[PDB]
Symmetry: D2
Subunit: 380 residues, 4 copies
């Protein structure tokens, strides 16, 4: 029925055989056959299918209202599997500020295989329509993006893709299935770095893909079995376990996000704040139409690099590490960590200033997170 219930009872996450209320961990690679060709329960080799991985795939299919789930050894492994739906000469339209790993995979690996890519500003969907070439086969969007949380209209993206014969894909990592369901808005394929919010405990590197399209699911399954970027059974188990608390965690994170944003907007050491909940934010109305909550990633400007470093060293409950979606609240400076490859003047032009801080709100007490960040900003 309601979401917190669906999180607990959606999918198949018990053992039919013993009745165990959690999915057994099938640390196994091959399965007995009673006769040549007769599989007891559909399992014959763990790369093709493993019952624990089948559990987590059923969960992600259920939570995204799809029919088919696929678990990969990372988010970029899932993204790669989806890109490998295409051939040499095919073209992909992506949003201009995709995740660095996606940009790197596309422009440094798949471009050598003749797959062509254009990164355009999808915050206006007519820029998608102009970017469409006779060779375009796929539209791939993140919303909201990193680290400036640009919002792209998912449903108009799906309509454009349907009308021009494109496979539409949404990287739904930042929102989770708890708040945003691209498959419900006409998208063909939804994917996640389960490394982030879904696993939620900074202890699994995993990717998840879901689709309702039988033929796309057949092609994704063939690609998974042939190239082999499968999630292992222990990691699939830890994903199922972490997803149990996704709703409770996202709602705690959302309460803290709202209060932290009021603080940031009021503080004098903070300039621009980037988050889709802010009403002046581009496509705020669109985000509210396609999601019923918010990501925990917030970016905001302090004055310079020295102010950013002092901010990080003055906090008690903000942890300096990479990734997002932990139970801990994480803090980082994109210009020094994720975007240090880009020349500084081009970082400035894009909005990745030297004093741009990104926090990933965790599940600590809301007042503690607000007060801690505020006193750290008071030292500036």
């Amino acid at each position: 029925s309601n979401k917190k219930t669906k999180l607990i009872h959606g999918g198949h996450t018990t053992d039919d055989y013993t009745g165990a209320v959690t999915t057994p961990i099938y640390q196994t690679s091959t399965y007995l056959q009673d006769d040549i060709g007769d599989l007891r329960q559909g399992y014959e080799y763990s790369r093709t299918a493993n019952p624990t991985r089948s559990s987590v795939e059923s969960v992600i299919a259920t939570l995204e209202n799809g029919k088919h789930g696929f678990a990969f050894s990372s988010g970029v492994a899932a993204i790669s599997a989806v890109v490998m739906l295409l051939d040499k000469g095919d073209h992909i339209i992506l949003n201009s500020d995709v995740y660095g790993g996606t940009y790197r995979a596309l422009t440094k690996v798949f471009t050598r295989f003749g797959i062509e890519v254009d990164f355009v500003d999808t915050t206006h969907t007519d820029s998608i329509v102009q970017a469409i070439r006779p060779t375009t086969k796929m539209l791939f969007i993140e919303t909201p993006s990193n680290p400036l949380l640009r919002v792209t209209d998912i449903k108009k993206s799906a309509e454009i893709a349907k009308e021009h014969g494109l496979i539409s894909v949404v990287d739904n990592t930042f929102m989770t299935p708890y708040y945003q369901n691209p498959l419900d808005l006409g998208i063909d394929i939804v994917l996640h770095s389960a490394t982030k919010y879904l696993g939620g405990h900074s202890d699994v590197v995993a990717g998840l893909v879901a689709t309702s399209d039988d033929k796309l699911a057949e092609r994704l399954a063939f690609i998974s079995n042939s190239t082999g970027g499968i999630l292992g059974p222990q990691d699939s188990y830890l994903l199922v376990r972490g997803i149990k608390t996704l709703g409770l965690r996202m709602e705690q994170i959302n309460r803290s996000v709202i209060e932290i944003i009021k603080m940031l907007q009021a503080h004098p050491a903070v300039q621009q704040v980037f988050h889709p909940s802010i009403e002046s934010h581009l496509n705020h109305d669109v985000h509210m139409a396609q999601a019923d909550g918010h990501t925990g990633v917030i970016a905001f400007e302090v004055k310079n690099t020295e102010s950013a470093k002092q901010l990080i060293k003055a906090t008690s409950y903000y942890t300096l590490a990479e990734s997002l979606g932990a139970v801990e609240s994480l803090i980082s400076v994109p210009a020094l960590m994720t975007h240090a490859s880009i020349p500084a003047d081009i970082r400035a032009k894009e909005g990745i200033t030297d004093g741009l801080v990104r926090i990933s709100v965790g599940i600590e007490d809301t007042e503690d997170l607000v007060d801690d960040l505020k006193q750290a900003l008071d030292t500036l």
Copy 2:
């Protein structure tokens, strides 16, 4: 010093910090930084590097006398990563009877990316030299192959590759690093389905790659980090643990292989036997020159499909399952299991008759395995 010692003490498989005599399992995705950019021990995100995966990579590098190890989520994930060293328009020469998964990945995935492949009979290396095109960039050989155990001269393959500017690759799954070291014979890259002998307990799906070439290692590392088919930490741990007993297991398997082959050659219900230890076997001398032991995979002919089925049902210690390299002895009929896609007349032409049985010798008692298979054959 000697191999059984190197298996126990080669690589880094203890904890420097606590002194734990086994590699800790880093069920983790991200790492604290004391200052922006300063990693405590070189770890910042588990897809890029994880200390347990680093353990297993050091082991495979050491055992193959390489300098660099890479752990992937499966054997075909490692094979795919190696093939992705190439671009659209590049050409690969492979042995004619490669593993079905390798054939499928190449002709159904990477061919769509403009990578061109030819499967030639590498048992005569001048067939490699004739197959070389101006676009050839890679030579990929398995030795011995499945299921007929054709042997390819590794050292002449390396010389040909060096002289024509090819990356040479050997799939060394069937021999393990215990018996055959391609990097020592001039090969650029050696790889394994660690799912088989190395893990050795039918409970990990994994791939391992090793190389001594710094620039190839840099390209493999970039491909791994960008496409993300990484082995998880629990599976890396179970690989380290299984590899500890590789020598003891391979030597038990080899004793049983020798006795089982004497039995098979003597039995009247058995026709041709395929194994590189048989002196009449093509390139037997070559195998003995490049390996100091044998694989546990044996194939032999019984009369027809009904005889094969009766053989399988009459054994007590031979398990009907897919894969190889278990502690259990595994039995299968390629024409009904791995090769049932190929039309029967073409299976016959290739030597995959309806009564071709493949066994993967396990570590049961030698006399039990011999006697069991013999009494089962006596029922024919």
Copy 3:
């Protein structure tokens, strides 16, 4: 600072060496020594101490405001370790309705070792004072108890114990450290079945003990090392991971508990309801003085056994299983499951009627849990 923050940052749950933001899993039994007697980090044999178990012990010590933590292979293993602080001839006072496993261990195991026990109604603390014998050495109370949730005054129990020289122990399983901290109220030892709320995912059987008393901690450590009921490293890891969400889960459970109780009191198929939040409940004022929230265990009367069975079969979101503290909501009939050993007339006398239902509220949506239970009760 505040509780949800202390849950995330209390204890030591990162790797000092690599910086891993989660506790490494030391699947290991022994540790290198650089010189005879010099341990690198205090570890020499995993039964004595293991770094993952040390992590979970630091967490339970921190959350209960103690100084020493101990992880055992189950709740009854922790209870047994605490009882083994005594000698033949020593006497224990316990509350009259202790957990069946505690009653069984005491009257069927430790009584054979000359340890004497009396079960008295501790809801009036002067019954403790009367029960004190010259041989009494320990006072052991659960609050609230199972399945009728009788409340015992913890702070007066601690005063009585201090004045008469008794080791005071509280089984704090039902409340968790999130809501009730016996060590803060003068109790010597607090313990938990971490199998329930703390692990919180029905996938670890574990016990946790905490104390601030150095000499009791030394005796508990000696007992643990000598009798060996230690928690393994994988289970210690899963406990740390589950405890991360304890606050979010307990607060969801508490919201649902309040609404479910309003429903149960209003429904005509329900008679008596047992929970410490009900104002007419014995020692409600005491509970509110010693805890700032509620357990998720509720018991209530329906008419008979047939009504109980129909209730269980008519619910959609209530799972029929043993134990409590899951993410799922669990339902059971004590007279048929936990108390079926006791003759029925004595069950009736104690209040364990044939139609007594016990639910353990999970973290599903509150309205779904209320509506589901209500429609199931409407079928009666």
Copy 4:
């Protein structure tokens, strides 16, 4: 049939449901019931029984030719469970040099519960007969013992126990079920620290108990369920996996033991050597009658403490750590490590001289182990 086969196929270590060729890891605590009291497969709560633990229990029962297996969280947890078969006032006869942990548990824990113990020299069984009191209920022997490998006649011990109404127990850790089967010689209960040879990889702390006696099995099961020192499912899995290679490992260890002993006897820096394979060793004939192989633990005298320390620092393949039964070869000085509590003059009287070295032979190459130890001894 033969032992190496029984190791692979004895017990139930596959999944009946999916056919998985390895035992699934049931990381779970409770099980669905279809109706109140009807368990799907006999599981209702993991402390009582867990399907992975059931797997390892079936293996130890099969390997010891018993009917009932029990897995505990450590060897001393299994020993404690067995001792708790007795009541206050009961008396136990043990061999004079029991494992320190057994001595400590008995004289510092269970003696406070009125269980009485005498440690006598069981190398002459008539010393058992003299030690029998009217209150004696149990006879507990290790053979061979640590660190001087004293041998006790198992079959005469069983006869004495049967004639006087004693429960007979053998701690069979040092021999493993591969070489010595006490239940076959009339013993009631056999137990193991599975931490050592059975797990065999220094990565599980576990105890195993086996018996053929239904009523003793019922009492052991009750004690296990009530006091809760159960092995967890991940550790039970790793035990099953390690036991697969027990035969191969023990046979490698035995080959190395024989050669190392020839070396030690020949070397001039070595005085007395203690091992049951030496023909002049007390009860050598008895050992050969009750076992068909040898333990890997050897003790030998060098001149003093300084010679022992130099020996340890001069070896390349001998690791200084606690415990035994690793894949690595372990070295230690009892007088400085396990026996440093005992006053030095009493250590001398017992034979634990300052220069007594104990090695636990691992599975490295035999010549490497011999040569390494010999060159290290040449530096003395």
